[PDB]
Design a protein around this nucleic acid. Structure first.
Ligand SMILES: [Mg+2]
Lengths: 55, 55
DNA sequence: CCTTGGCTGACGTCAGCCAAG
DNA sequence: CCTTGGCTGACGTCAGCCAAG
């Protein structure tokens, strides 16, 4: 029926919600991780900076 | 009254749906901002190590 | 060159929670 | 402590889109 299309679309949306959820999580990770990198790198670049032309 | 609230409520849900929005945007952004500073430091690194100790 | 249907924004409503009155 | 406001999540509906025949 119209009643069937309704159900599917119900369910759909549900799934469809999980997703966004997930993709935002993931994003929320990444950044963390990127945040990691980026900081460590800067600590790296520091120390090398730390022993120049030799000391 | 029952209505009045609904109405108020409905406008909250709007504003909020919007804070989310942006939020995912924000993320999406720094994700790349990060992504960026990130290559760069590495190159910057890539530089100085091999230009370290003398060559 | 059309029909479909899946997918997904956006809405408004119902719940519960957590300040702040 | 109330209780009562606001905010937020999860939910169903509805509308429009673009692939896949
Ligand atoms: Mg949303």
């Amino acid at each position: 029926k119209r009643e069937v299309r309704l159900m599917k679309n119900r369910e759909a949306a549900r799934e469809s919600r999980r997703k966004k959820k997930e993709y935002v999580k993931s994003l929320e990770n990444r950044v963390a991780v990127l945040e990691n990198q980026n900081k460590t790198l800067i600590e790296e670049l520091k120390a090398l900076k730390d022993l120049y032309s030799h000391k």
